[PDB]
Ligand SMILES: NC(=O)c1ccc[n+]([C@@H]2O[C@H](COP(=O)([O-])OP(=O)(O)OC[C@H]3O[C@@H](n4cnc5c(N)ncnc54)[C@H](OP(=O)(O)O)[C@@H]3O)[C@@H](O)[C@H]2O)c1
Ligand SMILES: NC(=O)c1ccc[n+]([C@@H]2O[C@H](COP(=O)([O-])OP(=O)(O)OC[C@H]3O[C@@H](n4cnc5c(N)ncnc54)[C@H](OP(=O)(O)O)[C@@H]3O)[C@@H](O)[C@H]2O)c1
Ligand SMILES: NC(=O)c1ccc[n+]([C@@H]2O[C@H](COP(=O)([O-])OP(=O)(O)OC[C@H]3O[C@@H](n4cnc5c(N)ncnc54)[C@H](OP(=O)(O)O)[C@@H]3O)[C@@H](O)[C@H]2O)c1
Ligand SMILES: NC(=O)c1ccc[n+]([C@@H]2O[C@H](COP(=O)([O-])OP(=O)(O)OC[C@H]3O[C@@H](n4cnc5c(N)ncnc54)[C@H](OP(=O)(O)O)[C@@H]3O)[C@@H](O)[C@H]2O)c1
């Protein structure tokens with residue numbers, strides 16, 4: 001059994017990754033995963049959980065807000081007490097507050113950092129500890145092309161994504177000594193609830209969640225000897 | 241049908257990519273590729289061609305030394321006259337001359353640059369022109385982690401690989417305006433004839449060519465709307 | 481008068497930058513600055529102020545904590561109300577909490593981010609608004625080599641410095657449209673109170689604050705047509 | 721006495737660097753530079769030589785085309801025989817051939833690479849050997865923002881500049897072990913003969929060669945303990 005924890009599994013990219021893992025197992029006999037799915041909305045988890053079980057995958061739903069250190073503790077405790085082992089952590093949960101530099105607020109800043117940087121760091125800190133002892137494990141970070149490129153209305157978002165890359169790079173130093181794989185997925189525009197509105201013509205200039213999920217699962221299925229360290233995906237026409 | 245040209249298909253990564261495309265078409269009914277395989281050794285081409293045909297793929301071998309502008313012309317003409325269309329170019333052909341800074345010769349320099357930079361540039365120039373007119377196409381560049389990181393015995397190799405990245409980045413500017421996808425594959429140590437001899441470590445500390453071929457083919461199979469711009473792969477233990 | 485605000489002016493690099501600007505005003509008469517010096521320690525500001533005055537420069541000290549939004553507002557209004565404009569902002573104030581991944585605390589995280597990212601962002605937001613209106617101005621960000629490279633005990637520090645680079649890059653987008661210069665200073669090890677300890681040996685393998693201050697002042701003195709966008713400095717023997 | 725060799729000293733940036741070094745000696749009584757000036761045009765060398773001697777600097781002119789290996793040999797021989805020591809090498813000589821991807825020729829390629837990569841590599845190889853033995857020395861590489869960013873009509877130029885960066889990064893690995901400093905100067909548009917034409921408005925959005933020379937000389941004058949590894953400069957309005 002492969003124990004996988006996917007955060008932000010209720011919508012968009014996280015949801016797509018969960019389904020792709022479920023489908024991959026349905027066609028990859030030797031691969032039997034337990035999909036531990038988490039997000040802030042129980043209702044979303046119930047729906048994706050059902051969809052994954054429909055594919056024949058085992059699931060475990062846990063409602064948690066990683067911006068709340070208490071929930072980070074609960075997530076960790078859940079893995080430790082119920083499985084005592086973790087094979088894959090997909091740090092997908094993330095938020096974005098966009099706007100002109102002058103319009104961004106302290107609330108926009110705190111909201112963005114509490115999830116993108118704080119929750120992501122402490123969940124990683126706690127679960128990497130298990131992988132370190134196992135001398136095995138794979139951590140995926142869904143950052144963004146915004147982790148290496150700036151955009152006008154993304155001052156705070158870019159600080160948070162460049163920041164996540166900083167954590168990713170530090171984790172590589174720890175991981176190479178413990179047989180742990182670190183993958184940094186950097187996508188450009190993906191049509192998901194994160195965008196809200198989105199006109200018809202705009203949707204045609206975006207990638208779809210499943211486009212990101214495929215490479216993520218393939219990376220996990222690579223033999224342990226190899227790590228897809230980075231995967232950058234964008235709409236063929238470039239950034240919006 | 242899809243017209244694909246893979247340079248350096250005789251061995252190593254190029255051979256692995258050719259074979260993976262063949263296997264893909266075998267389990268992905270709707271993808272019928274014509275694998276145009278090129279190398280400097282006709283003998284290698286015949287062997288890999290047979291293997292691909294065993295998977296049920298159509299092949300077309302042609303001997304060509306991309307360091308020879310005459311052969312670059314012959315290769316381009318072949319695609320234009322025999323197919324008059326190209327869907328995928330895999331710029332895999334490449335050489336490596338390594339050694340301490342003080343020991344590298346003018347010959348090491350010319351040999352490396354004539355293939356990695358000159359041949360690669362002119363073949364790309366000619367075939368991209370076709371894709372630009374088609375408003376469709378995918379070009380893969382097998383560069384290296386040495387395209388963004390230096391290694392003591394790779395002064396000339398790094399000059400050529402950083403150089404290839406310069407070409408890749410310029411091609412993105414052109415490609416995004418004509419529906420063409422550009423993929424930069426950057427692998428670390430891969431056990432291939434390029435290394436020569438190995439032992440306990442080396443091999444055990446390296447990736448295998450098929451590990452690189454898998455994501456290359458998956459990137460090509462992505463819907464036209466999405467481009468996997470970069471894929472960085474390394475042995476889980478890091479550079480050695 | 482050239483109105484300069486230097487945060488973290490009481491110690492290390494900030495202190496050296498303040499002194500170097502004062503010395504430049506003595507050697508380059510055409511340059512008349514008002515050095516607004518700020519930090520969290522009053523006595524520090526009094527001493528550096530006296531030293532800068534000894535060089536014949538004008539100074540204005542203000543004790544403030546940039547992690548306190550009220551003080552950020554106080555610093556900004558002081559500039560507007562007393563001088564009406566700002567010509568240079570040196571975002572030097574910064575903190576560092578280091579340790580093995582497993583030893584870092586929530587307090588280490590909050591303390592680092594509140595100053596390095598939050599205070600820096602909001603002070604930049606406020607003062608850039610002024611420069612944008614003036615269509616003139618220069619903002620220096622003292623980030624670090626840790627903004628592009630990771631170090632084992634710098635997981636949180638790197639998240640914060642990579643994060644600052646994210647802000648820097650976004651600011652360039654805004655700055656180019658209103659004649660404002662953005663400079664990102666990235667130093668390696670510099671002997672300052674931030675390191676505490678000592679050892680004549682390791683101290684000999686570090687740069688000195690004045691080595692960083694020189695290029696900063698030279699960059700400000702460049703004609704308005706030119707911006708030194710980035711300056712990377714390291715001990716000749718590399719990172720320690 | 722400091723022995724400094726500056727290639728491409730007859731025009732633009734190289735010429736400005738030579739003059740700035742000569743002028744800097746005025747504020748440093750213990751700095752007596754011997755400026756070895758080289759380029760392909762003897763007439764230009766005589767001119768800059770006179771201007772430098774007028775500033776009180778010792779000069780030595782040598783006509784050499786670094787794209788001709790024979791000249792690289794004679795240039796190297798000159799340094800070894802006349803001085804037997806070299807304190808600074810400024811690899812400034814460089815050429816540019818621009819145009820749409822489809823219009824670039826094999827000659828554009830060879831001309832660019834023979835100077836930017838080949839001549840630069842072998843001159844660096846030969847002189848670094850002297851510095852390694854001395855356990856002292858400083859090498860400046862004038863690359864470009866085009867060494868990290870692509871431009872539409874710069875496919876070949878970018879291959880050569882990204883390529884130069886590859887050499888720079890490899891040199892850092894060797895330099896850190898023998899007390900040698902490596903500086904990578906990356907400028908954006910600079911009004912020099914390289915551009916030829918002008919239009920006042922155009923020239924108004926460019927930097928001037930003296931703007932580049934200033935930081936170069938100051939980097940050399942830093943104490944030996946510190947190396948300014950990179951300096952990126954651009955017009956305040958950005959790339960044209
Ligand atoms: N969409 C793009 O264009 C794009 C591009 C590049 C990178 N990314 C990144 O990809 C990741 C997913 O983006 P998306 O487009 O899929 O966003 P989305 O459609 O809004 O879905 C986000 C998911 O993350 C969960 N989540 C957010 N904050 C959380 C928290 N504090 N605790 C627990 N769960 C949390 C959300 O839960 P709730 O809905 O229940 O609150 C939801 O399940 C993010 O890191 C995003 O930055 C997205
Ligand atoms: N192997 C690694 O660890 C590694 C890591 C990073 C990047 N790469 C890159 O991956 C690519 C393939 O490497 P590899 O390890 O597979 O090398 P390899 O095992 O030596 O195979 C190289 C292939 O390229 C062909 N080739 C070379 N120069 C050519 C030319 N001028 N014209 C036509 N064909 C030419 C060779 O043909 P002949 O044998 O008939 O001459 C052969 O078919 C290269 O760009 C290499 O730099 C390799
Ligand atoms: N030192 C290095 O090796 C090195 C290398 C690369 C980058 N850097 C960066 O360079 C900058 C300065 O470092 P340093 O070594 O000079 O540090 P330092 O010697 O400890 O001095 C830091 C200065 O910043 C002030 N400061 C810190 N947080 C502040 C806040 N929230 N509000 C107001 N003032 C604050 C401190 O004031 P108080 O002392 O009164 O509290 C002090 O005046 C930092 O951004 C640091 O990250 C340092
Ligand atoms: N100008 C810009 O906007 C800009 C921006 C970024 C980087 N750069 C780089 O800065 C460096 C200087 O550029 P520049 O604008 O000063 O060029 P420039 O005004 O055209 O002057 C070039 C100098 O280099 C010499 N040179 C060129 N090729 C040579 C060779 N093969 N052998 C010996 N000497 C040679 C030229 O000598 P002859 O005239 O006698 O042939 C001349 O002295 C180059 O590496 C260039 O790529 C320039």
Ligand SMILES: C[C@@H](O)[C@@H](O)c1cnc2nc(N)[nH]c(=O)c2n1
Pocket residue numbers: 096098144145146151187188189194195196
């Ligand atoms: C790279 C960046 O475009 C990408 O991370 C991203 C994700 N979600 C987004 N969501 C909105 N609403 N706006 C954006 O610009 C945006 N952008």
